[PDB]
Symmetry: C2
Subunit: 372 residues, 2 copies
């Protein structure tokens, strides 16, 4: 069952991805534990940055020998990549693998390279320029400032986001590893808020970087790396609620939830996304993101039913909207909305969600008999 499911799900994610000219494949590996690992390949839309669907989940337990995880892990990725392309196919070309590599950078790249896959990878540590004999940060820091830029870096805790000023620098770079030369992007916070550790990124990518415009697209894309964590979060919640409230179905159901933490991710997005957009001037987008139907995330049954269920409720929420829907589902989950945010939590969502799910059993039950 488990894997076969995935394939199915995946399939869905792929078919959905064709309807778009360019997309980003965000990926990370995580520690999901009970009271083993999961590398996930999440895909967004490269224009509205709206989540499209989860492309793949690499599951594996803890590398038995102590320090043998870093190897067991470092190949799970490959496996995935390997299986992403397999799934995606030729769309692959429309995909910019976004991520962070703490290790085996080399690999990833050679791997990405042989296949001529697009990407952006932020290099977590210090590597070396084999043609400058100079450190990345170094070589790169010696380049002439390409120009300034301000992005919106997230902030966690409770929480709005913090706008950060950036000083970019572009460059080509050859790693030691296998004499792999490629373009780097160096971004340093300018006047970082008080006490806040100054931002500083060193991205390597397939993508152009000659001009400030070119380097932004990179800095930007990257900036959209954090999305996967959310997925992760929305998941571990709707999960650690079912494993906080409930066999053989343990590694199974999660695989489900994964595809269920998506729709929620896409229900919250219906609202947040738009907001984000504006803040960056992009109106058309937001305008399209927010202007989504429900049919996008929902199901007629889930649509009709969630309709009756949530009757004397919408205000700003356009009728038949994803936005609406999200909201309904929030309420059903208990969206009081004190602080006036319109930003329901994962719990409420999962609630109203699972809830929207029960009543369904009803409706569906009737409907069936209603015939037979």
């Amino acid at each position: 069952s488990a894997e076969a499911i995935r394939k199915a799900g995946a399939m869905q994610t792929v078919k959905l991805a064709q309807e778009f000219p360019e997309l980003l494949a965000i990926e990370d590996t995580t520690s999901l534990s009970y009271r083993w690992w999961v590398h996930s390949v999440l895909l967004l839309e490269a224009t509205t940055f709206r989540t499209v669907g989860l492309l793949h989940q690499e599951w594996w337990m803890r590398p038995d020998d102590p320090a043998d995880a870093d190897e067991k892990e470092s190949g799970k990725w490959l496996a995935a990549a390997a299986t992403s392309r397999l799934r995606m196919g030729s769309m692959m070309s429309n995909v910019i693998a976004v991520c962070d590599r703490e290790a085996d950078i080399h690999a990833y790249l050679q791997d990405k390279l042989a296949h001529n896959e697009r990407f952006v990878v932020r290099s977590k540590h210090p590597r070396k320029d084999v043609e400058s004999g100079l450190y990345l940060y170094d070589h790169l820091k010696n380049q002439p400032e390409l120009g300034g830029y301000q992005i919106s870096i997230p902030q966690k805790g409770v929480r709005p986001a913090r706008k950060a000023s950036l000083s970019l620098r572009s460059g080509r770079i050859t790693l030691k590893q296998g004499n792999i030369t490629l373009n780097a992007v160096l971004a340093e916070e300018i006047n970082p808020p008080k006490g806040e550790t100054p931002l500083k990124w060193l991205l390597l990518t397939s993508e152009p970087v000659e001009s400030l415009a070119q380097a932004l697209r990179v800095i930007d894309i990257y900036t959209h790396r954090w999305r996967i964590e959310e997925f992760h979060k929305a998941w571990k919640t709707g999960a650690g609620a079912e494993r906080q409230r409930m066999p053989d179905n343990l590694e199974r159901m999660v695989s489900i939830l994964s595809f269920v933490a998506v729709r929620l991710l896409q229900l919250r997005e219906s609202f947040t996304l738009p907001q984000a957009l504006r803040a960056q001037g992009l109106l058309k987008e937001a305008e399209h993101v927010e202007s989504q139907s429900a049919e996008t995330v929902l199901t007629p049954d889930e649509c009709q039913l969630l309709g009756y269920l949530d009757k004397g409720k919408r205000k700003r929420k356009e009728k038949g909207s994803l936005q609406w829907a999200y909201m309904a589902i929030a309420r059903l989950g208990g969206f009081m909305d004190s602080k006036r945010t319109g930003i329901a939590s994962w719990g409420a969502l999962w609630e109203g969600w699972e809830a929207l799910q029960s009543k369904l059993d009803g409706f569906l039950a009737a409907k069936d008999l209603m015939a037979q």
Copy 2:
């Protein structure tokens, strides 16, 4: 809303009680608290001892001055009695108020007396025989043993019940209080299990007591006092689940749950009752108790729906039964049933129950539209 509800509910309890020749009104006052009081009048069937419905709920908070509760409380009862008879009416005659009085015995009795209400009251402490100038236990203990008898006294903790041997003694007795003379029943355990505190009851009642047969009916009826605690328990659970998981609706909803902890009480009974019966030889009863439909506790919607929902499930459970139903609802709540008891807990019940409730929203939702 709150009280008006009760009245409604009550009404139901009354109308249901007419269909029976004799009934017992069990009553107790309880401490329901959050993280004030409730005297409840629960009614059973005096022949199968199957719960009929809750007759009344006396609600009141803590008597502000310290030791002023015992007075505030001691009149809440009256209030109830007063309001039970009001509700019941002439059926009153078919009712044997069963209970335990730690205080104001006198009152209760005078009260019961003036109205010519039937009853059995166990006198928790030592009062005095004003015509024997001898203590109850005393006077009574001087009487000749009327004969032996074995009943089934419950056992708590985790738990089957403990059969206890009894040595009865009958008698008339006049209290000091208002020169109130009435019949007493003295029951003492014979060879009580090891370490177990020996049983010993001193009941006062309207009922006959001359012959062993007459005294049993009393000892028996009484023995059916514990039922109210269950109600209480089934309630505080399905409650402290909704107050463990969730305003203005706090004192309201409970009043509901009260009428909802009944049906569950009646769903468990569908099984337990029968068992109890047999153990006491009474077959016809059990045979009728267990032979109940669902329509008794359920609703067509809840019946049909709980039907689909629980399809590939029954075995011993006769089709269309309360028993069935109970079981279904248990499962829906998660009745694994390891120890092989067929004795689901209050939690499972409340679960599958509340659950049976969600899906309903479905079904009912469809059904409505299905038309409109």
